[PDB]
Amino acid sequence: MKTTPDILDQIRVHGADAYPEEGCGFLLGTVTDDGDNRVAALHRATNRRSEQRTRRYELTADDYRAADAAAQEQGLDVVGVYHSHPDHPARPSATDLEEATFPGFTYVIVSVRDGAPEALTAWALAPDRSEFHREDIVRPDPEAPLEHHHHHH
């Protein structure tokens, strides 16, 4: 998972944005030349819809499929998921580990205590799906060549 400091902060802010409501967040981005994922866009699974007068991409729902569509709208896809819980500083629990259906996604665990975003951690799920392994937070190379999966809508 490649990510920039600006994105990392936006992640913790989205945790405070989601709270006190029950919502997680999806990681939308591009596939780096290494074969690894870079998070470039963020979207929390919580409905943020005021009375705005404009045309819709589809509808507001913030469900995975809605995020999938929004991803395509941005020319990206869901490269990972993240969820905050007020228990343990930063590591997946038993149930959310068990509910991890996507062993190819990067799972970010972030400490948000009733609205207060403390620290963020990125975890990679084992291909056999028994547990998570810790990955270090890496910024995209200071050049970043052409993408091969990225589209532009």
Distance CA 5, CA 106 (A): 17
Q: Which residues are catalytic?
A: 22
Site of tokens 């620290």: 119
Long-range contacts of 98-107 (CB under 8 A, 24+ apart): 100/125, 100/129, 103/127, 103/128, 103/129, 105/27, 105/78, 105/79, 105/80, 105/81, 106/1, 106/27, 106/37, 106/39, 106/79, 106/80, 106/81, 106/135, 107/80, 107/81, 107/82, 107/83, 107/132
Method of determination? NMR
Structural domain total, the chain: 1
Structure tokens at 51: 């009375």
Q: What is the CATH number of the domain that holds 96?
A: 3.40.140.10
Task: Please name the residue ranges forming H helices in 19-115.
Answer: 64-74, 94-98
Domain enclosing residue 71, as ranges:
1-153
